[PDB]
């Protein structure tokens, strides 16, 4: 119907609130995720009032196309949401209530740079379409924003779900619009990653350091190359759960470091053998005895430097 | 049309019943599953009655938009269901019957912590939307809840399909609502997993223990590292059917244990060789003879301790 | 419109016939398959007749919502079909004809227990919704059931496509209903599986039996373990086309058997070496000479016993 | 509206033409492919004419439900197409024009038997639904059949796009119908397959023939088995782009041949070693010297025989 | 309604502008990508004017089916877009404004021939359907073409987004039409590819060149073949992110080159051993000393020649 009359110079205020039911399917490559949630609205129009004399229970008719309903759009969504309108009720002064339910696929950036121990913020963006007579502004109702205890994400824990009360007023296509921001803070559960990825890798790296305790060329070659193939196959196994990231990550830095260490180990085995065939066993013995201590200390220092550069 | 008159102070009772046709596509990563089932309803409204004088067969007209039909929503569903209305019939006292058919994609948590020998419970959640004049409460009709013998799940057996008769009355968005809970208990068929995963793994582990019966360094290195690569490739093969779980599982504990045993075996081979090159064959002989018995007993005890900690 | 008058006490008979165009996408994990087919119907109602005096060509009007059309539902389908109504024609005595076209995704169990040389039966299930005045029963028209020569399934040949003329009358939800069964018998083309899976596997198994012709420990260890890794990678390659089956199959029995034989071969190599180091070459020689003949005979007998237990 | 009057005994002729925009997503397993194309129609009905006195520009009204439009169906399509009607125009003698645009998913068989150097023909099938008064026959308009220079298929070149002008008149479900056939000839670009698949395979095969130049058992075993594993992993890598084909292909014949050659090489190494240990070096030397020349000639002859049997 | 009157001989000009929100899901195999964007339109019709006397705020009614709206189609799209009409406003001289929002899946060719360091241009194509009375031509509004700072593509940076102001006027299906071209220039972020693909490959290649520093046949065979398997598995790992390209690429040329170098290394090891067994150690020593320097220089020169032939 017609919008509220412009006699009340105050912008029509719509108290919004989103109530989460469950968040599922947090895709990392497309950086999307689907949601299922309620959506509340409330606004006051003294042009449709309710006389107390009809009833004391505040008779609140469900009016289709008999009332002016402000319509809400989501910004970062691939498709329009699947709204299911439940009930609309009118107060005796005309403070009309509202209730819906939707499912949507949201687009939000992710940052996989602390990947195993990272934390994300997800955003949902709400605008309201202007009207000719009156004005509409958006406002947050703290008693309606919440989440169910049935909201589970596979792998994540949910910290907070708040809504910045300040709209970001701007002009677009020669039109002024207001925006609302809903933030969802989640942290990744990282205990399973240690015994699943980290410790077997370090076991395989430590196996190839037992070649500094031997003088047999063939055994040392077998050891280092076979462990290198092992590491390649473990990388193949790990990559299946790693989201494809066209940038730099702590895990890939570690993997490059392991690659480098493997190369240097092969170099040292070759140098020991070449020296020993040239009839200089003292120099080879010294070099292998040096390397025994040299390799782990350097590995530890490099790992400390990388954890300082990434998590500091 | 108009809801039943509030003269009968009793809440309008709706006897519900779900009748399963088939459950298919039990996804483990998204923890969803699709269903196909009937849905029955029955309720009594003396405002639309049927005179016995019209017919003795209880003439039961199919009324579209001529009758007040209570509408049912599912809670843990990604999209609204695909309802196909079959037939509505009116009794002579106004006890109206109802019949539909739907397909839906349900969200329900799974717990893959006893993974090979686990058992799940699946939930379907039903609410009824309130009405202004009268009240509606939900009730379960035991003669309509059942499953077809054509309900197959790939890999699972079906134990029971019941419906808790107690609604979970609560208030949401300033509205009181009732809920119904349908539980489906399924158990996983675990015989195929033994000869498919467990026994070849133990064969590969037992092959690398034949190095305690040898004094040849090169052969022992070949044996242990090649079996280790074998184990890595078997893990790569197994992971393709394992749902990705960001938590702790019995199977992954076993795999970590195998990794540890491999590391310790490599350590012992290196220690034997180092001792033997230093001209101390008695000590190496004792250590290998100890290890022969030591490794299987420790493996058995660790496996017993893990099966006690997980299945007890 | 109104159903046929109950004056003719005979149930309204609907001659059905399904005519296949193509069957595509035979999924094995979901055990579904999509179809594309015509659907014919014919029924006689003397309440809408056609006077011969209007025309001698039996004027047959296309009546939308002017005629009582019995509606047909499929039982084992994920979603309702995509019906495209072509033409409806009325005979001079009221024997009305019918013609549609649909595409559907059908759910039907498969049994992958003779997997390489198995044969399946696919089912499509048809019910008719009752009516108040008259009765409807279902009947099969042999002149309309057929398949196009353009029906191809990737990998399968089509034997027969018949329709059991006997309905399975039963009562459901306090309603009696009739059912029709359409069966499609298909057999799997198994020639490509031999040179693709079977013969290379037997080649790899025969390669590791050349260690009974050698006395070199290192060569024998290399041979058996490297072939074992080979077998693991071939299993990885084969599993990509094998549908995931949570039960017992002939192929997996063969694979378990190969695993066992590999274990026993490693045991025998270790026993020969241990005996030879203990200064007992006669016993080792006898054992290897025994094994040369012993291994293939046992393999043949086990394979015969398995083919008898699975295909008999 | 009503069909054209049967006074003109001539069947209503509809000049059809399909104009390609782009062909994308040529799936090989499902043997489908999607298309995007225009669709033209033209037919003459003197029952709706246009007087020259209204305008000399041949006023051509866009008539919805004011004109009899013949409707066109596609036969080998999974779903109905997405028709977007652009414009309908009427000529002064009633030769009405027509224009649409559709996207469709077409089912068409493929034959992957010359796989690397094969050529396909794709078919689109058009029927017209009969009418009661007049008759409709189909006819091809050569000035409307074409393709855009923006039609790209990933990997294929497009040779021709023609339309057999002869309908295949037949009777189906007691109804006579006409069919139109549109053929699209495509050839596969095969240069990238040589350096990507063929040459590295031949390199790996040639590496294992360097064992005929050695007398060291351990080195020869390492060489042949390690190359065999290499070949298995290369097969694993190649299979990812090969469509799954349940039949016989040139490539798989080559692969089986390589498997056989590997087996025979292992046999010859074992025979040389066995002969040499038995104190008969002359016979072993002769056999290895024979094999050096024998293996490549046999490989060449087998490859020639296979290319003659498959491409001749 | 009726189109603008042909009295103004000037073609109706429609100022278009596309405003990007986000570009996601840049598929490389299908060469598609989805978009989400606004779409502006503006055109002047003095047949619907607005009297200044009604209001000074230029009363601008939202007219559904009361105004002649020119309709816009996209050419290279799989399906029609998901238009959501926001608001239409009329100026006092009849310069009507327009505003929509759509999501679409666009087809555009890609050229993966400089793959790691390539740059693409994406196209969106707009036509306008002619009208009988007046003419419509298309024109670009520079104040409406833009992109949000929230437009992210996973892996790419966005350079420019412009619109060629010149239409490509042509005649199709006996109709003249105008076209608009929107170009989006993107460049690929290539830093992560070096430490992820390039350096480990060169490490593995350098490891196998340590065999020119040894005279032990068995060790040299182990080294070269094991590194070759390593390279095969690294290729298997790399191919998972490489789009399937049926043509020639810089990366595949590099990989073929590595394959060739591996073959030549095996040849040289065999030649050294054969010479040394024939009692000619001076010639073998010279050949290995030559190869030490010969291999890297040749590798560098070949890489320079390939980077000149591909990026020049
Ligand atoms: C001991 C020091 C160890 C150094 C390890 C440093 C390290 O981790 O650098 C990684 C870092 C990449 O960071 P990411 O987050 O992975 O960014 C790309 C996305 N994955 O690497 C780079 O910047 C590229 C490579 C730089 C170093 C190249 C070194 C080459 C020299 C070869 C060694 C020769 C040894 C000779 C011995 C005699
Ligand atoms: C540039 C691209 C790199 C190409 C790939 C490199 C192949 C591997 C090279 C291996 C070098 C091994 C050298 C060796 O064993 O010789 C040790 C020899 C000892 O002989 P002496 O009596 O002390 O004096 C020489 C006269 N007899 O010389 C040395 O000690 C050299 C020091 C060893 C460090 C060499 C580091 C090379 C690393 C290259 C990284 C490139 C990136
Ligand atoms: C012999 C004792 C064997 C111990 C095995 C214990 C075991 O299974 O622990 C597993 C358990 C993880 O449980 P999951 O269910 O897998 O949880 C994560 C999700 N997968 O492991 C952990 O808690 C992490 C690792 C703890 C142990 C670390 C041990 C490291 C010490 C190295 C051994 C050195 C040996 C030296 C010999 C001289
Ligand atoms: C910390 C990070 C770990 C780094 C990776 C470790 C590399 C592998 C180390 C292998 C050690 C092998 C030691 C060896 O063979 O020497 C045996 C030598 C015998 O010599 P004796 O005459 O008895 O006295 C010494 C003077 N001759 O010493 C021993 O017996 C040591 C006891 C062996 C147990 C060592 C356990 C080390 C495990 C490290 C786990 C780290 C997590
Ligand atoms: C020589 C005899 C060969 C026996 C092979 C028998 C066989 O194939 O049994 C397979 C059969 C499984 O059938 P499937 O169809 O695969 O069912 C599960 C789904 N895949 O295996 C089983 O039933 C489980 C295992 C039973 C046997 C276990 C044997 C363990 C004993 C180890 C051998 C020790 C040898 C010592 C030598 C000294
Ligand atoms: C239980 C879990 C299994 C753990 C994994 C097993 C590791 C592999 C064991 C290998 C045993 C090799 C024994 C060997 O080589 O010794 C041969 C030795 C010969 O010595 P004699 O002079 O005849 O008398 C002994 C005094 N000198 O003894 C034999 O002949 C034993 C017979 C060999 C068969 C053993 C079969 C063991 C299979 C275990 C399967 C478990 C499932
Ligand atoms: C049937 C299933 C096949 C089972 C798997 C086969 C295992 C591999 C068998 C290897 C056989 C090696 C024979 C060998 O090295 O002996 C050579 C020995 C030489 O001894 P002489 O002094 O000439 O006379 C014998 C008395 N000293 O005999 C020969 O020359 C035999 C000829 C070699 C060809 C054998 C071909 C066997 C191929 C089997 C394929 C089955 C399919
Ligand atoms: C040293 C010179 C190194 C030459 C490397 C040249 C090169 O990279 O050519 C690659 C190029 C392909 O280009 P792509 O972009 O990959 O096109 C197909 C899609 N992937 O290769 C080809 O054209 C095909 C092969 C041509 C060369 C074939 C050489 C065969 C000869 C074998 C060598 C024998 C050595 C004997 C030594 C004694
Ligand atoms: C054609 C298809 C190719 C088939 C696969 C090839 C298998 C590998 C062949 C290996 C050849 C090794 C030759 C060898 O070691 O002999 C060295 C021998 C030395 O003997 P001399 O005393 O100098 O004179 C000979 C009389 N004693 O001869 C040589 O030096 C030959 C020169 C070596 C280069 C050979 C290059 C062959 C490359 C084939 C590529 C095919 C594509
Ligand atoms: Cl929305
Ligand atoms: Cl629902
Ligand atoms: Cl249906
Ligand atoms: Cl169609
Ligand atoms: Cl469009």
PDB file of C-alpha atoms in Angstrom, chain D residues 4-191:
ATOM      1  CA  UNK D   4      -4.795 -22.870 -40.446  1.00  0.00           C
ATOM      2  CA  UNK D   5      -7.835 -23.858 -42.472  1.00  0.00           C
ATOM      3  CA  UNK D   6      -7.678 -27.220 -44.276  1.00  0.00           C
ATOM      4  CA  UNK D   7      -8.787 -25.584 -47.528  1.00  0.00           C
ATOM      5  CA  UNK D   8      -5.185 -25.370 -48.736  1.00  0.00           C
ATOM      6  CA  UNK D   9      -4.578 -29.118 -49.015  1.00  0.00           C
ATOM      7  CA  UNK D  10      -0.833 -28.456 -48.839  1.00  0.00           C
ATOM      8  CA  UNK D  11       0.819 -29.317 -45.503  1.00  0.00           C
ATOM      9  CA  UNK D  12       1.885 -26.218 -43.611  1.00  0.00           C
ATOM     10  CA  UNK D  13       5.615 -25.923 -44.286  1.00  0.00           C
ATOM     11  CA  UNK D  14       7.901 -24.634 -41.524  1.00  0.00           C
ATOM     12  CA  UNK D  15      11.355 -23.565 -42.657  1.00  0.00           C
ATOM     13  CA  UNK D  16      13.653 -24.254 -39.704  1.00  0.00           C
ATOM     14  CA  UNK D  17      17.193 -23.115 -39.032  1.00  0.00           C
ATOM     15  CA  UNK D  18      19.579 -23.456 -36.079  1.00  0.00           C
ATOM     16  CA  UNK D  19      22.375 -20.921 -35.575  1.00  0.00           C
ATOM     17  CA  UNK D  20      25.116 -21.825 -33.126  1.00  0.00           C
ATOM     18  CA  UNK D  21      26.495 -19.408 -30.539  1.00  0.00           C
ATOM     19  CA  UNK D  22      28.795 -21.654 -28.484  1.00  0.00           C
ATOM     20  CA  UNK D  23      29.190 -25.332 -27.603  1.00  0.00           C
ATOM     21  CA  UNK D  24      30.583 -25.943 -24.112  1.00  0.00           C
ATOM     22  CA  UNK D  25      31.100 -28.730 -21.591  1.00  0.00           C
ATOM     23  CA  UNK D  26      31.581 -31.825 -23.760  1.00  0.00           C
ATOM     24  CA  UNK D  27      31.315 -34.504 -21.091  1.00  0.00           C
ATOM     25  CA  UNK D  28      32.711 -37.890 -22.095  1.00  0.00           C
ATOM     26  CA  UNK D  29      31.468 -40.166 -19.297  1.00  0.00           C
ATOM     27  CA  UNK D  30      27.793 -39.126 -19.534  1.00  0.00           C
ATOM     28  CA  UNK D  31      28.381 -38.514 -23.268  1.00  0.00           C
ATOM     29  CA  UNK D  32      26.470 -35.273 -23.047  1.00  0.00           C
ATOM     30  CA  UNK D  33      27.131 -31.689 -24.131  1.00  0.00           C
ATOM     31  CA  UNK D  34      25.344 -28.363 -23.629  1.00  0.00           C
ATOM     32  CA  UNK D  35      24.526 -25.956 -26.447  1.00  0.00           C
ATOM     33  CA  UNK D  36      23.460 -22.331 -26.871  1.00  0.00           C
ATOM     34  CA  UNK D  37      21.797 -21.423 -30.170  1.00  0.00           C
ATOM     35  CA  UNK D  38      19.108 -19.435 -31.972  1.00  0.00           C
ATOM     36  CA  UNK D  39      16.123 -21.096 -33.639  1.00  0.00           C
ATOM     37  CA  UNK D  40      14.232 -19.704 -36.640  1.00  0.00           C
ATOM     38  CA  UNK D  41      10.800 -20.606 -38.020  1.00  0.00           C
ATOM     39  CA  UNK D  42       8.688 -19.410 -40.941  1.00  0.00           C
ATOM     40  CA  UNK D  43       5.248 -20.454 -42.178  1.00  0.00           C
ATOM     41  CA  UNK D  44       2.451 -19.031 -44.310  1.00  0.00           C
ATOM     42  CA  UNK D  45      -1.212 -18.758 -43.288  1.00  0.00           C
ATOM     43  CA  UNK D  46      -3.544 -16.846 -45.629  1.00  0.00           C
ATOM     44  CA  UNK D  47      -6.171 -16.852 -42.865  1.00  0.00           C
ATOM     45  CA  UNK D  48      -4.266 -14.058 -41.121  1.00  0.00           C
ATOM     46  CA  UNK D  49      -3.236 -11.732 -43.935  1.00  0.00           C
ATOM     47  CA  UNK D  50      -2.139  -8.092 -43.919  1.00  0.00           C
ATOM     48  CA  UNK D  51      -3.767  -5.525 -46.190  1.00  0.00           C
ATOM     49  CA  UNK D  52      -1.176  -3.418 -48.069  1.00  0.00           C
ATOM     50  CA  UNK D  53      -3.352  -0.372 -47.387  1.00  0.00           C
ATOM     51  CA  UNK D  54      -2.487  -0.276 -43.667  1.00  0.00           C
ATOM     52  CA  UNK D  55       1.216   0.305 -44.378  1.00  0.00           C
ATOM     53  CA  UNK D  56       3.844  -0.334 -47.017  1.00  0.00           C
ATOM     54  CA  UNK D  57       6.350  -1.521 -44.405  1.00  0.00           C
ATOM     55  CA  UNK D  58       4.271  -4.701 -43.978  1.00  0.00           C
ATOM     56  CA  UNK D  59       2.894  -4.056 -40.500  1.00  0.00           C
ATOM     57  CA  UNK D  60       3.806  -7.172 -38.524  1.00  0.00           C
ATOM     58  CA  UNK D  61       2.127  -7.308 -35.123  1.00  0.00           C
ATOM     59  CA  UNK D  62       3.565  -9.283 -32.217  1.00  0.00           C
ATOM     60  CA  UNK D  63       0.612 -11.526 -31.410  1.00  0.00           C
ATOM     61  CA  UNK D  64       0.563 -13.567 -28.184  1.00  0.00           C
ATOM     62  CA  UNK D  65      -2.214 -16.207 -28.241  1.00  0.00           C
ATOM     63  CA  UNK D  66      -3.628 -14.387 -31.293  1.00  0.00           C
ATOM     64  CA  UNK D  67      -1.862 -16.620 -33.834  1.00  0.00           C
ATOM     65  CA  UNK D  68      -1.397 -20.347 -34.343  1.00  0.00           C
ATOM     66  CA  UNK D  69       2.254 -21.086 -33.495  1.00  0.00           C
ATOM     67  CA  UNK D  70       3.558 -24.585 -34.281  1.00  0.00           C
ATOM     68  CA  UNK D  71       5.578 -25.880 -31.331  1.00  0.00           C
ATOM     69  CA  UNK D  72       8.903 -27.704 -31.665  1.00  0.00           C
ATOM     70  CA  UNK D  73      10.304 -30.388 -29.358  1.00  0.00           C
ATOM     71  CA  UNK D  74      13.824 -31.789 -29.089  1.00  0.00           C
ATOM     72  CA  UNK D  75      14.140 -35.554 -28.741  1.00  0.00           C
ATOM     73  CA  UNK D  76      17.581 -36.297 -27.258  1.00  0.00           C
ATOM     74  CA  UNK D  77      17.497 -33.765 -24.429  1.00  0.00           C
ATOM     75  CA  UNK D  78      17.498 -34.427 -20.699  1.00  0.00           C
ATOM     76  CA  UNK D  79      15.208 -31.467 -19.943  1.00  0.00           C
ATOM     77  CA  UNK D  80      13.077 -29.090 -22.003  1.00  0.00           C
ATOM     78  CA  UNK D  81      15.042 -26.178 -23.389  1.00  0.00           C
ATOM     79  CA  UNK D  82      15.102 -22.627 -22.052  1.00  0.00           C
ATOM     80  CA  UNK D  83      13.250 -20.853 -24.831  1.00  0.00           C
ATOM     81  CA  UNK D  84      13.316 -17.055 -24.880  1.00  0.00           C
ATOM     82  CA  UNK D  85      10.894 -15.731 -27.495  1.00  0.00           C
ATOM     83  CA  UNK D  86      12.259 -12.597 -29.181  1.00  0.00           C
ATOM     84  CA  UNK D  87       9.889 -11.480 -31.950  1.00  0.00           C
ATOM     85  CA  UNK D  88       7.106 -12.740 -34.224  1.00  0.00           C
ATOM     86  CA  UNK D  89       6.260 -10.841 -37.418  1.00  0.00           C
ATOM     87  CA  UNK D  90       3.491 -11.287 -40.005  1.00  0.00           C
ATOM     88  CA  UNK D  91       4.022 -10.746 -43.745  1.00  0.00           C
ATOM     89  CA  UNK D  92       1.371  -9.208 -46.011  1.00  0.00           C
ATOM     90  CA  UNK D  93       0.403 -12.631 -47.459  1.00  0.00           C
ATOM     91  CA  UNK D  94       0.573 -14.174 -43.982  1.00  0.00           C
ATOM     92  CA  UNK D  95       4.063 -15.704 -44.201  1.00  0.00           C
ATOM     93  CA  UNK D  96       4.713 -15.368 -40.470  1.00  0.00           C
ATOM     94  CA  UNK D  97       8.297 -15.220 -39.201  1.00  0.00           C
ATOM     95  CA  UNK D  98       9.614 -16.446 -35.855  1.00  0.00           C
ATOM     96  CA  UNK D  99      12.725 -16.172 -33.651  1.00  0.00           C
ATOM     97  CA  UNK D 100      13.832 -17.811 -30.373  1.00  0.00           C
ATOM     98  CA  UNK D 101      16.887 -18.649 -28.302  1.00  0.00           C
ATOM     99  CA  UNK D 102      17.508 -21.716 -26.142  1.00  0.00           C
ATOM    100  CA  UNK D 103      20.080 -23.567 -24.080  1.00  0.00           C
ATOM    101  CA  UNK D 104      19.908 -27.350 -23.821  1.00  0.00           C
ATOM    102  CA  UNK D 105      21.803 -30.397 -22.567  1.00  0.00           C
ATOM    103  CA  UNK D 106      21.985 -32.940 -25.413  1.00  0.00           C
ATOM    104  CA  UNK D 107      22.543 -36.709 -25.211  1.00  0.00           C
ATOM    105  CA  UNK D 108      24.638 -38.147 -28.035  1.00  0.00           C
ATOM    106  CA  UNK D 109      26.797 -41.284 -28.237  1.00  0.00           C
ATOM    107  CA  UNK D 110      30.570 -41.041 -28.510  1.00  0.00           C
ATOM    108  CA  UNK D 111      33.017 -43.664 -29.784  1.00  0.00           C
ATOM    109  CA  UNK D 112      36.411 -43.522 -28.042  1.00  0.00           C
ATOM    110  CA  UNK D 113      38.061 -46.283 -30.053  1.00  0.00           C
ATOM    111  CA  UNK D 114      40.656 -44.204 -31.925  1.00  0.00           C
ATOM    112  CA  UNK D 115      40.756 -42.025 -28.781  1.00  0.00           C
ATOM    113  CA  UNK D 116      43.816 -39.806 -29.442  1.00  0.00           C
ATOM    114  CA  UNK D 117      43.033 -39.422 -33.160  1.00  0.00           C
ATOM    115  CA  UNK D 118      39.230 -39.808 -33.302  1.00  0.00           C
ATOM    116  CA  UNK D 119      36.413 -37.791 -34.857  1.00  0.00           C
ATOM    117  CA  UNK D 120      32.836 -37.500 -33.621  1.00  0.00           C
ATOM    118  CA  UNK D 121      29.413 -36.670 -35.032  1.00  0.00           C
ATOM    119  CA  UNK D 122      26.874 -34.989 -32.747  1.00  0.00           C
ATOM    120  CA  UNK D 123      23.131 -35.097 -33.428  1.00  0.00           C
ATOM    121  CA  UNK D 124      20.155 -32.890 -32.561  1.00  0.00           C
ATOM    122  CA  UNK D 125      16.690 -34.258 -33.336  1.00  0.00           C
ATOM    123  CA  UNK D 126      13.568 -32.172 -34.046  1.00  0.00           C
ATOM    124  CA  UNK D 127       9.917 -33.255 -34.297  1.00  0.00           C
ATOM    125  CA  UNK D 128       6.729 -31.258 -34.878  1.00  0.00           C
ATOM    126  CA  UNK D 129       3.413 -32.072 -33.222  1.00  0.00           C
ATOM    127  CA  UNK D 130       0.578 -32.826 -35.637  1.00  0.00           C
ATOM    128  CA  UNK D 131      -2.642 -30.814 -35.855  1.00  0.00           C
ATOM    129  CA  UNK D 132      -6.225 -31.822 -36.556  1.00  0.00           C
ATOM    130  CA  UNK D 133      -7.333 -29.662 -39.523  1.00  0.00           C
ATOM    131  CA  UNK D 134      -4.119 -29.213 -41.526  1.00  0.00           C
ATOM    132  CA  UNK D 135      -0.776 -31.036 -41.743  1.00  0.00           C
ATOM    133  CA  UNK D 136       2.694 -29.769 -40.820  1.00  0.00           C
ATOM    134  CA  UNK D 137       5.907 -30.936 -42.489  1.00  0.00           C
ATOM    135  CA  UNK D 138       9.436 -29.786 -41.692  1.00  0.00           C
ATOM    136  CA  UNK D 139      11.892 -28.149 -44.086  1.00  0.00           C
ATOM    137  CA  UNK D 140      15.408 -26.738 -43.785  1.00  0.00           C
ATOM    138  CA  UNK D 141      16.312 -23.119 -44.593  1.00  0.00           C
ATOM    139  CA  UNK D 142      19.944 -23.052 -45.730  1.00  0.00           C
ATOM    140  CA  UNK D 143      20.216 -19.286 -45.165  1.00  0.00           C
ATOM    141  CA  UNK D 144      19.596 -19.671 -41.416  1.00  0.00           C
ATOM    142  CA  UNK D 145      21.751 -22.706 -40.525  1.00  0.00           C
ATOM    143  CA  UNK D 146      25.187 -21.557 -39.415  1.00  0.00           C
ATOM    144  CA  UNK D 147      27.608 -21.102 -36.562  1.00  0.00           C
ATOM    145  CA  UNK D 148      29.274 -18.099 -34.958  1.00  0.00           C
ATOM    146  CA  UNK D 149      33.028 -17.641 -35.076  1.00  0.00           C
ATOM    147  CA  UNK D 150      32.656 -17.477 -31.265  1.00  0.00           C
ATOM    148  CA  UNK D 151      31.837 -21.204 -31.060  1.00  0.00           C
ATOM    149  CA  UNK D 152      34.823 -22.759 -29.280  1.00  0.00           C
ATOM    150  CA  UNK D 153      35.108 -26.269 -27.891  1.00  0.00           C
ATOM    151  CA  UNK D 154      37.973 -26.939 -25.494  1.00  0.00           C
ATOM    152  CA  UNK D 155      40.221 -29.313 -27.432  1.00  0.00           C
ATOM    153  CA  UNK D 156      38.191 -29.724 -30.636  1.00  0.00           C
ATOM    154  CA  UNK D 157      37.966 -28.075 -34.032  1.00  0.00           C
ATOM    155  CA  UNK D 158      34.654 -27.702 -35.856  1.00  0.00           C
ATOM    156  CA  UNK D 159      34.460 -28.949 -39.440  1.00  0.00           C
ATOM    157  CA  UNK D 160      30.844 -28.656 -40.590  1.00  0.00           C
ATOM    158  CA  UNK D 161      27.290 -28.049 -39.383  1.00  0.00           C
ATOM    159  CA  UNK D 162      24.610 -29.244 -41.819  1.00  0.00           C
ATOM    160  CA  UNK D 163      21.025 -30.509 -41.657  1.00  0.00           C
ATOM    161  CA  UNK D 164      19.725 -33.523 -43.573  1.00  0.00           C
ATOM    162  CA  UNK D 165      16.787 -32.184 -45.582  1.00  0.00           C
ATOM    163  CA  UNK D 166      15.057 -35.583 -45.648  1.00  0.00           C
ATOM    164  CA  UNK D 167      12.734 -36.238 -42.694  1.00  0.00           C
ATOM    165  CA  UNK D 168      12.558 -39.766 -41.307  1.00  0.00           C
ATOM    166  CA  UNK D 169       8.802 -40.300 -41.429  1.00  0.00           C
ATOM    167  CA  UNK D 170       7.605 -43.034 -39.048  1.00  0.00           C
ATOM    168  CA  UNK D 171       4.572 -43.926 -36.908  1.00  0.00           C
ATOM    169  CA  UNK D 172       4.790 -43.881 -33.099  1.00  0.00           C
ATOM    170  CA  UNK D 173       2.004 -44.514 -30.550  1.00  0.00           C
ATOM    171  CA  UNK D 174      -0.522 -44.673 -33.412  1.00  0.00           C
ATOM    172  CA  UNK D 175       0.668 -41.255 -34.695  1.00  0.00           C
ATOM    173  CA  UNK D 176       2.755 -40.288 -37.732  1.00  0.00           C
ATOM    174  CA  UNK D 177       5.608 -37.837 -37.074  1.00  0.00           C
ATOM    175  CA  UNK D 178       8.489 -36.216 -38.973  1.00  0.00           C
ATOM    176  CA  UNK D 179      12.065 -35.811 -37.739  1.00  0.00           C
ATOM    177  CA  UNK D 180      14.955 -33.478 -38.563  1.00  0.00           C
ATOM    178  CA  UNK D 181      18.640 -34.301 -38.074  1.00  0.00           C
ATOM    179  CA  UNK D 182      21.356 -31.718 -37.362  1.00  0.00           C
ATOM    180  CA  UNK D 183      24.920 -33.058 -37.535  1.00  0.00           C
ATOM    181  CA  UNK D 184      28.055 -31.431 -36.107  1.00  0.00           C
ATOM    182  CA  UNK D 185      31.409 -32.894 -37.167  1.00  0.00           C
ATOM    183  CA  UNK D 186      34.334 -32.270 -34.807  1.00  0.00           C
ATOM    184  CA  UNK D 187      37.929 -33.504 -34.800  1.00  0.00           C
ATOM    185  CA  UNK D 188      40.237 -33.777 -31.801  1.00  0.00           C
ATOM    186  CA  UNK D 189      43.472 -31.797 -31.572  1.00  0.00           C
ATOM    187  CA  UNK D 190      46.120 -34.462 -30.968  1.00  0.00           C
ATOM    188  CA  UNK D 191      49.499 -32.707 -31.013  1.00  0.00           C
TER     189      UNK D 191
END
